[PDB]
């Protein structure tokens, strides 16, 4: 009796447009079943009206099954360029972004996966997602707990944020840093850790996102994975940690991170060595706690070995030397550190670094390290024997000449640094003879006239030490040092005033 049992697209498109929702729901199911077959797919993808109806129904329906079926249909069409284009041109992105707010998982999954496909292969998709407010929706979803979903969501964020300062700011405003750090500290799924580390790397170069990542516990979270078997993950964490380092010098609970970084200096991967050295240099800056920990785990030796391996590679020696500089001053184990640099055979290479081909940034740091090393009397003779004095004087003379930004460094800083190093080295009777013999007194007296308070201090300091010897005190007086030193008794700097009084007393 009932016959005709077993143009389909044009018929279904009409049904999805029906005002009757029960009809729309049933048609939605049929369309979805058809999207499962490649044959029926092309027919759907080629119909502008079909796609538009699917997109409209999805964002307007109140039926969960209809939302699921239409979202699933679009996902099925997203595997082909033609499908991606049709979805794109039919207003699919705003619709999909709206679906990211759905309380049903199946719908969210179809939406985020289809969006990822659009972002990867559809020209114009990134901009559309940003405009539609996708960034904000995605960050909000980072509190979900399905690790596969989180991996796709975070990668979408990476695609959208890469090379786009505005997107990074949006992510920041939506609380992205804290959510991303939470992921790093909570999950173990490598692909997610990796996609998430890529986002953090991108954000870490933003001056606004850097402080937010650090305060969220980012340094500690990234540090937790520096030993994971995934090389790509370790590298991403290291690069990110380095970018953030200059903003994490006030963080606590860095013990674990510092320990691993020191061990990483012993890596055969020069890129890992370079990053770890850079991170260590910044983390040891004005933080006695961090210096203590680094020294306790053999950091001095590791850093000396790093300098030796680096050779003339200044992208490795600068941070390694700066780090050694930080480790040799102002902390309970600074004295031990000053001795360790010597006991680990580092005095010769440190002095060598004062010579060409080293550039000013490295020389500046090296002078600073030698200044620290000189605080340890056992280093007085070794430093002299390696020729440190003559070179320091050479640098001083050159730098002073200029003062009468060079290669990125202010020569005034070199004058202050070399003269300070010489001031400390002059504590040694033998070094005083060498310093005196290089005809340095006239130059030291001239520095008393320096407009820089710190230069007058170290100049008076070295003259004070030199004046301990009669003949020297005589040479200092003959240079007309009396006049300026007397005026310096009125210095606002206690050190200057004190050193000046000491020299005046000795000249008499």
């Amino acid at each position: 009796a009932v016959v005709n049992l077993i143009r389909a697209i044009p018929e279904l498109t009409k049904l999805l447009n029906d005002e009757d929702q029960v009809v729309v729901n049933k048609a939605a199911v049929m369309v979805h079943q058809l999207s499962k077959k490649e044959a029926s797919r092309h027919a759907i993808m080629r119909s502008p009206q079909m796609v538009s109806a699917i997109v409209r129904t999805m964002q307007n329906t109140n039926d969960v099954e209809t939302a699921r079926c239409t979202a699933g249909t679009l996902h099925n069409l997203s595997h082909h360029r033609e499908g991606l284009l049709a979805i794109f041109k039919s207003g699919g992105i705003p619709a999909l972004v709206k679906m990211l707010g759905s309380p049903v998982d199946s719908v969210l999954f179809y939406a985020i996966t289809t969006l990822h496909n659009l972002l990867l292969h559809q020209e114009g998709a990134k901009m559309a997602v940003r405009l539609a407010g996708g960034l904000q929706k995605m960050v909000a979803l980072l509190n979900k707990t399905n690790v596969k979903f989180l991996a796709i969501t975070t990668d979408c964020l990476q695609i959208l944020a890469y090379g786009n300062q505005e997107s990074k700011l949006i992510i920041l405003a939506s609380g992205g840093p804290q959510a991303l750090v939470n992921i790093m500290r909570t999950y173990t799924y490598e692909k997610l850790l990796w996609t998430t580390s890529r986002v953090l790397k991108v954000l870490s170069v933003c001056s606004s996102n850097k402080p937010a990542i650090v305060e969220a516990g980012g340094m500690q979270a990234l540090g937790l994975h520096l030993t994971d078997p995934s090389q790509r993950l370790v590298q991403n964490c290291l690069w990110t940690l380095r970018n953030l380092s200059d903003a994490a010098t006030k963080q606590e609970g860095m013990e674990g991170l510092l320990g691993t970084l020191v061990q990483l200096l012993g890596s055969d991967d020069i890129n890992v060595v370079t990053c770890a050295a850079g991170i260590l240099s910044n983390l040891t800056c004005n933080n006695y706690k961090n210096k203590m920990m680094v020294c306790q785990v053999g950091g001095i030796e590791a850093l000396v070995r790093t300098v030796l391996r680096a050779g003339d590679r200044e992208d490795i020696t600068e941070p390694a030397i700066c780090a050694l500089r930080h480790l040799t001053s102002r902390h309970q184990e600074a004295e031990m550190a000053q001795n360790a640099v010597r006991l680990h055979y580092g005095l010769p290479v440190v002095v060598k670094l004062l010579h060409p081909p080293s550039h000013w940034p490295l020389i500046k740091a090296t002078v600073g390290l030698i200044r620290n090393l000189a605080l340890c009397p056992a280093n007085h003779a070794p430093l002299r024997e390696q020729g440190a004095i003559p070179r320091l004087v050479q640098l001083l003379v050159r730098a002073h000449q200029d003062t009468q930004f060079v290669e990125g460094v202010r020569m005034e800083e070199i004058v202050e640094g070399c003269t300070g190093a010489l001031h400390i080295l002059a504590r040694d009777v033998h070094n005083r003879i060498v310093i005196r013999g290089l005809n340095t007194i006239p130059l030291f007296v001239q520095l008393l006239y320096s407009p820089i308070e710190n230069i007058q201090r170290v100049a008076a300091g070295v003259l004070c030490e030199l004046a301990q010897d009669k003949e020297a005190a005589e040479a200092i007086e003959a240079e007309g040092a009396t006049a300026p030193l007397t005026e310096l008794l009125h210095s606002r700097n206690e050190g200057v005033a004190t050193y000046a009084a000491a020299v005046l007393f000795r000249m008499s």
Binding site: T113, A151, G163, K191, W194, D246, N282, E318, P319, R325
Partner: protein
Amino acid sequence: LGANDELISFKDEGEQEEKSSENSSAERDLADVKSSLV
């Protein structure tokens, strides 16, 4: 006592990639993840 500590900026080092090189694709790793999630 001693030299003053100083920070090092890695601004250029970090901004290098996003300026000179195009962004990498993670499809190889996520393809299976996406099909599985769906």
